[PDB]
Specification:
This is part of a larger assembly, with 7 protein chains of 7 kinds. Chain B has one helix spanning about 5-25. Chain B is mostly helical. Chain B contains 1 helix and no strands. Helices cover about 85% and strands about 0% of the residues of chain B. Chain B is rod-shaped. Chain E has one domain: Ribosomal protein L30/S12 (60s Ribosomal Protein L30, Chain: A), CATH 3.30.1330. Helix content of chain E is about 45%, strand content about 20%. Chain E has a 4-stranded mixed β-sheet with strand order 1-4-2-3, sandwiched between helices. Chain E is globular. Chain F is an alpha+beta fold. Chain F has one domain. In chain F, strands 1, 2, 3, 4, 5, 6, 7 and 8 form an 8-stranded mixed β-sheet that branches. The longest helix of chain F is centred in the last third of the chain and has 17 residues, at about 140-155. The radius of gyration of chain F is 21 Å and the shape is elongated. Classes of the chains: A mainly beta, B mainly alpha, C alpha+beta, D alpha/beta, E alpha+beta, F alpha+beta, G alpha+beta. Chains in contact: A-C, C-E, D-F, D-G, F-G. Bound molecules: potassium ion (4 copies), magnesium ion (17 copies) and zinc ion (ZN) (2 copies). One magnesium ion binds near residues 155 and 159 of chain A. Chain F binds 2 RNA strands through strand 6 and helix 4. Chain F: One of its GO terms (molecular function) is structural constituent of ribosome. Chain F: This is Small ribosomal subunit protein eS1A. Chain F: It is found in: Cytoplasm. Chain F: Belongs to the eukaryotic ribosomal protein eS1 family.
RNA sequence: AUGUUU
RNA sequence: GGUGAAAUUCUUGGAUUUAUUGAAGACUAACUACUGCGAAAGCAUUUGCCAAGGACGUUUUCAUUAAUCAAGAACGAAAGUUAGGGGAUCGAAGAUGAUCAGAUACCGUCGUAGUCUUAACCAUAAACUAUGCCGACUAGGGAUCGGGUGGUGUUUUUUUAAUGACCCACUCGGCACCUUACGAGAAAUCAAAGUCUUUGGGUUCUGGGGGGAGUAUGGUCGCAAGGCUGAAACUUAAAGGAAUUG
């Protein structure tokens, strides 16, 4: 509930005690029930397997990636998202990766990831079409909907409130050094207006 | 006049006629 | 007979929400309500549960997929590229 | 039994560069251009300015300790000209007559495998 | 090709279609070859291979699924495994491997 | 007014170990100082010198050789093979109309660890009694010739170290091997190994670097 | 009227030929229509062959040449006199001088 | 390099 | 830098140039041609896979199953549209520098959409050979592409030969070309634009002086831009084609 991507319940055997250990993975696309998932340094490069980032070749597509070895997955967890392995630095062992936002990150080569892309992709391509569907979407996430515009408020309620016309009145780009109660609008905006041209600055 | 530019001017004129006809009802 | 000329499944929305939004919803609704071939038993019995879950009515096998279709093009590309990388690593 | 640099004559239009470097190329010696030796904004590519610049570069190379130069001559290349400018020939001539020894003249103009659609539009410069 | 040989067997020789009849033919020892679809469940595939190992019967692995195997044998229904009882006038049993 | 060449000291590029001759020239670098080491400024320089200079014979006027400085020892830069390339003039001279240009390239690993890309070129030629004026190949001949050349390059590398391949390129025995293996497909007048490109180096291993 | 029997180009049996850009003005002209001239110039003539032979450290260098295939549009070729306007009968003469 | 109309 | 010359712009925060690297996206130079394939639009790095195709060979098979085709379908450059990805370059718009009498034109520097890709539209080009398709026949010639046939042929290795490449001759199909034109045309020119007043091999489509006008209106298709269909009033003695002399 509240998550775009489906979850996979993978049952492992406890290596030190006779019992079963169930894990809640984020299902990668193509993973099916009854499938054998192999997790570890020596696992094969198959979709759904959990491998350290250093053990996979350049160009590999991984998901649920650990920022640090052992944090059990931090990156590329939302539906349809993935991390691209773009290179390795075996001396001072590190892996260069491309994050879903397009940022290039250097991660420890012992950090683990799941081979494949998170399931549920293309979810945001369908128009919600209804306040009701937005209502039920956020009914299981948090009380962040609906959103009243600040310009529609009174000056007491918001920096944008008040005026004989609904207007901001001053620049909506707010400094990063501003304080709580001031950071309404575009916080630390490097630019504004419609984005024209190429992204992914380098 | 160039045939191409006469065609362009006529196309703009039809666009204007369509707009005015849509305005009218 | 053909009950609707073009709206199809999106006739349930009447005249609301805009024609472009209704068409965008129509494509993906057809995709998500279609039946798909089971890769395991070979029957056209795979239907969506929640988004990303695709279950075969016969053989009761469930596969992770796209939100509105069994396999997205990105996932197919990833599968082929991992096949290639695995084959290069093993040989 | 000589000490060899690399001449590196980039003879574009609008300018000529006489850039003698070490054999590796990382360390340079007295890169002088036609615009440094003439101030007219149009004789920068002239053979005379190229000759003066090459003579100055040769004098500085002889003071540094360079006796011979392996010649690498280029045009703008890329997608623009592929034709060496009017000043590169005079620059090489002046390098030859300034007492420096010459070796291994080569054209290193950057030539693509049909990349980088050229500037000017499909109708070109309509002069 | 293999599909042509299989068509010849269906046209002239003797055959059975399906897991149950294939296993019955294997256990009676009147099976000369079993063709197993690519998408056969691996447990069923292993059981058929074990029966074939016990009966000294040849196994051919059809590259297509049950849909393609049914088409190759000329039926409108899925066939997961085919058993050849008599080859008829067909070279399927000898021109393999 | 600082005259930066007054603080620059010269080094001798004792570049090759096996080509013909130790000495290929000199290069100047900033004198070793507190926070900027002269060997640090060196050890990455790639010098491109003609194989004719390296051998002393003028029949190697093309085929410039790259030599990358691997280790610095006492006013002597020890380099190693970094790549080979034809000269632009020679390449353009070989490329002519009314004939078919065939190119092959492979990415192969030398016996020890060196990853190289080898680019070989060849051109169709007329027979002795040919009256037809162009002598083009039928592109199935081109596919076969490319396969033969690629196999020859792939097996010539992977069976030789970097030093062995370097010592094999100078006599151009690979060109003659390609001619022998392709004479039954097309005459192929101008077979050459036009380029060798280094893609990946093994661990430095100054011990086996010490062949010069 | 039709000025040239085939056309002002060389294209019969193709339909489309990829264009090239004029070296002088960068106009896009089909590759077959463009006036193509080869330059095989000596890398040094410059009244300087003797000068650089003397200055060379290599005896009998046999200095190389520069090769450059120039593609001209029709307007640029005519303006630069690479190609000249010929008489009606002389136009049907494809032999170079 | 720029030069309109009759 | 850039130009005819300049200017805008960048530059001792080291621009331009040099070397070693790295990333991105596009493109596929030279080879490249009066060469190839495709129904056309088009298609040019390698290799692998997937189907397809012409020609040739054929003492294989069927036996009229065919040709052209209203309605109807499929594809259809570029530009443009929708939504993602991508966005190096160039670059409608836009901004600027100059020129000019004015010059938000040509020229210079940037630069949005676009250019690329995926999933859908759009369905138009001087979409041209301004030459419908099928069939037969009527001059000569040499090339060239693909296939085949022959040689006491040349070279190449396997050891007999054999393919491979080449030479010679023939041959079928193709892209074209040169000469001549009995012939055709108003001529330019044309091996078809010939076999047409000595007028009939089959068949589809289109035009009927120039404008108004591919306009108005209606229909239909399209998200839109627009496409397809498509007048009339009125006006006019020419408009136009080819060639000749100035
Ligand atoms: K709101
Ligand atoms: K306010
Ligand atoms: K200049
Ligand atoms: K762009
Ligand atoms: Mg909102
Ligand atoms: Mg209020
Ligand atoms: Mg307040
Ligand atoms: Mg405020
Ligand atoms: Mg109010
Ligand atoms: Mg002009
Ligand atoms: Mg004319
Ligand atoms: Mg065309
Ligand atoms: Mg008058
Ligand atoms: Mg190419
Ligand atoms: Mg060809
Ligand atoms: Mg029709
Ligand atoms: Mg298009
Ligand atoms: Mg039309
Ligand atoms: Mg037409
Ligand atoms: Mg009329
Ligand atoms: Mg006229
Ligand atoms: Zn199933
Ligand atoms: Zn031009």
């Amino acid at each position: 509930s509240g998550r775009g991507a489906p979850l996979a319940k993978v049952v492992f055997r406890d290596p030190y005690k006779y019992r079963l250990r169930e894990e809640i993975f984020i299902a990668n696309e193509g993973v099916h029930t009854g499938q054998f998932i192999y997790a570890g340094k020596k696992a094969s490069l198959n979709v759904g397997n959990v491998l350290p980032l250093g053990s996979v070749p350049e160009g590999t597509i991984v998901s649920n990636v650990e920022e640090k070895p052992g944090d059990r997955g931090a990156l590329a967890r939302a539906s349809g998202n993935y991390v691209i392995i773009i290179g390795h630095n075996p001396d001072e062992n590190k892996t260069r990766v491309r994050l879903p936002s397009g940022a290039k990150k250097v991660i420890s080569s012992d950090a683990r990831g799941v081979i494949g892309v998170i399931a549920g992709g293309g979810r945001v391509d369908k128009p919600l079409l209804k306040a009701g569907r937005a209502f039920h979407k956020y009914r299981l996430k948090r009380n962040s909907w609906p959103k009243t515009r600040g310009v529609a408020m009174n000056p007491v309620d918001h920096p944008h409130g008040g005026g004989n016309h609904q207007h901001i009145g001053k620049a909506s780009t707010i400094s990063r050094g501003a304080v709580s109660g001031q950071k309404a609008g575009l916080i630390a905006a490097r630019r504004t207006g419609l984005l024209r041209g190429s992204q992914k600055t380098q | 006049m160039r045939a191409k530019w006469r065609k362009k001017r006529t196309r703009r004129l039809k666009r204007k006629r369509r707009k005015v006809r849509a305005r009218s009802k | 007979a053909k009950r609707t000329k073009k709206v199809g499944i999106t006739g349930k929305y009447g005249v609301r929400y805009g024609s472009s939004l209704r068409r965008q919803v129509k494509k993906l609704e057809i995709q998500q309500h279609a039946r798909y071939d089971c890769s395991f038993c070979g029957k056209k019995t795979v239907k969506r549960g929640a988004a990303g879950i695709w279950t075969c009515s016969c053989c009761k096998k469930t596969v992770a997929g796209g939100a509105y279709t069994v396999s997205t093009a990105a996932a197919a590309t990833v599968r082929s590229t991992i096949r290639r990388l695995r084959e290069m690593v093993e040989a | 039994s000589q000490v060899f640099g690399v001449a590196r004559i980039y003879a574009s239009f609008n300018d000529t560069f006489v850039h003698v470097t070490d054999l590796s190329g990382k360390e340079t010696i007295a890169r002088v251009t036609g615009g440094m030796k003439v101030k007219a904004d149009r004789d920068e590519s002239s053979p005379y300015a190229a000759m003066l610049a090459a003579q100055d570069v040769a004098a500085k190379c002889k003071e540094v300790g360079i006796t011979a130069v392996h010649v690498k001559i280029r045009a703008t290349g890329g997608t623009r000209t592929k034709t060496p400018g009017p000043g590169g020939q005079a620059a090489l001539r002046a390098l030859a007559r300034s007492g420096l020894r010459i070796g291994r003249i080569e054209d290193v103009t950057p030539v693509p495998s049909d990349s980088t659609r050229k500037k000017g539009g499909r109708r070109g410069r309509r002069l | 090709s293999i599909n042509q040989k299989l068509a010849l067997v269906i046209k002239s020789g003797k055959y059975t279609l399906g897991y149950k009849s294939t296993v019955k033919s294997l256990r009676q020892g009147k099976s000369k070859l079993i063709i197993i679809a690519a998408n056969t469940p691996v447990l069923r595939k292993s059981e058929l291979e074990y029966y074939a190992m016990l009966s000294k019967t040849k196994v051919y692995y059809f590259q297509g699924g049950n849909n393609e195997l049914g088409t190759a044998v000329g039926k409108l229904f899925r066939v997961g495994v085919v058993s050849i009882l008599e080859a008829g006038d067909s070279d399927i049993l000898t021109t393999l491997a | 007014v600082v005259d930066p060449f007054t603080r620059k000291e010269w080094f001798d590029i004792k570049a090759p170990s096996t080509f013909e001759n130790r000495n290929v020239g000199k290069t100047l670098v900033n004198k070793s100082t507190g926070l900027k080491s002269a060997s640090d400024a060196l050890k990455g320089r790639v010098v491109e010198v003609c194989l004719a200079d390296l051998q002393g014979s003028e029949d190697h006027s093309f085929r410039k050789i790259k030599l990358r400085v691997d280790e610095v020892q006492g006013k002597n830069l020890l380099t190693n093979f970094h790549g080979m390339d034809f000269t632009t003039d020679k390449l353009r001279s070989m490329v002519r109309k009314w004939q078919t240009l065939i190119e092959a390239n492979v990415t192969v690993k030398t016996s020890d660890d060196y990853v190289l890309r080898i680019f070989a070129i060849a051109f169709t030629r007329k027979q002795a009694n040919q009256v037809k004026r162009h002598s083009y190949a039928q592109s199935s001949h081109i596919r076969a010739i490319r396969k033969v050349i690629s196999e020859i390059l792939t097996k010539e590398v992977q069976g030789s170290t970097l030093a062995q391949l370097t010592s094999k390129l100078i006599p151009e025995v690979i060109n003659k091997e390609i001619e022998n293996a392709t004479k039954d497909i097309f005459p192929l007048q101008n077979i050459h190994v036009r380029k060798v490109k280094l893609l990946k180096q093994p661990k430095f291993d100054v011990g086996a670097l010490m062949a010069l | 009227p039709k000025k040239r029997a085939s056309n002002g180009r060389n294209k019969k049996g193709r339909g489309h030929v990829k264009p090239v850009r004029c070296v002088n003005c960068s106009k896009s002209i089909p590759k077959d229509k463009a006036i193509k001239r080869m330059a095989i110039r000596n890398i040094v003539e410059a009244a300087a062959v003797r000068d650089l032979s003397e200055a060379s450290v290599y005896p009998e260098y046999a200095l190389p040449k520069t090769y450059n295939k120039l593609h001209y549009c029709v307007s640029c070729a005519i303006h630069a006199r690479i190609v000249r306007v010929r008489s009606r009968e002389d136009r049907k003469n494809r032999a170079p001088p």
